[PDB]
């Protein structure tokens, strides 16, 4: 296991994945499994958005290189080799985060920390889709997480206590 050098300035054309990359940077230390899959999403999303401009072409090339090196570092890892356990693990992680926010939600305790939990949970769901699965059930949750994320945030700006 080792820490790879940071990627060069990220253009605005990748503002959408910008957050995803940062999330991986953090998860990289806590858990390379999530960070690994996270990088995959970026690359897949990166090419989907574009695939030209010497800036992008180079960016993708660099990102791809990091992915290859990362996979090698782990070697096998049941989480990487066997997507079966890796996927199941991701699902559990998202659930724990979501439930945690839900637990405090009904408890009548709202805060910025929870806001991040809902939003972050949404990012995790995206990382799950890359697998190719993703059922309607998860989709419903994503819609709720996004709504709850903004609903609370929007209400915060308005100066109103969540409910």
């Amino acid at each position: 296991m080792a820490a790879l050098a940071p990627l060069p300035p990220l253009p605005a054309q990748f503002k959408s994945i910008q957050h995803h990359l940062r999330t991986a940077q953090e998860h990289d230390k806590r858990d390379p499994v999530v960070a690994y899959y996270c990088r995959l999403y970026a690359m897949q999303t990166g090419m989907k958005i574009d695939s030209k401009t010497p800036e992008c072409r180079k960016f993708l090339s660099k990102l791809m290189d990091q992915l290859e090196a990362l996979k090698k570092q782990l070697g096998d890892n049941e989480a990487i080799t066997q997507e079966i356990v890796g996927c199941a693990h991701l699902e559990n992680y998202a659930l724990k985060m979501f439930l945690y926010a839900d637990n405090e939600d009904r408890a009548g305790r709202f805060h910025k920390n929870m806001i991040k939990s809902f939003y972050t949970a949404s990012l995790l769901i995206d990382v799950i889709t890359v697998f190719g699965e993703l059922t309607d059930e998860n989709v419903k949750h994503r819609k709720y997480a996004r709504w709850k994320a903004t609903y609370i945030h929007n209400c915060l700006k308005n100066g109103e206590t969540p409910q």
Binding site: R30, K96, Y100, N113, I115, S117, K143, R146, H153
Partner: protein, 36 residues
């Protein structure tokens, strides 16, 4: 159930939130839920 949400405005608020949270790369709260 949930009320009708505007994809346009919804994205506006979402993007904004991401930027704010992005400003804080290191958050103790994150480690709280992470490890739990």
């Amino acid at each position: 159930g949930t009320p009708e949400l505007d994809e346009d405005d919804l994205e506006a608020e979402l993007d904004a939130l991401g930027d704010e949270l992005l400003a804080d790369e290191d958050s103790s709260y994150l480690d709280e839920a992470a490890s739990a």
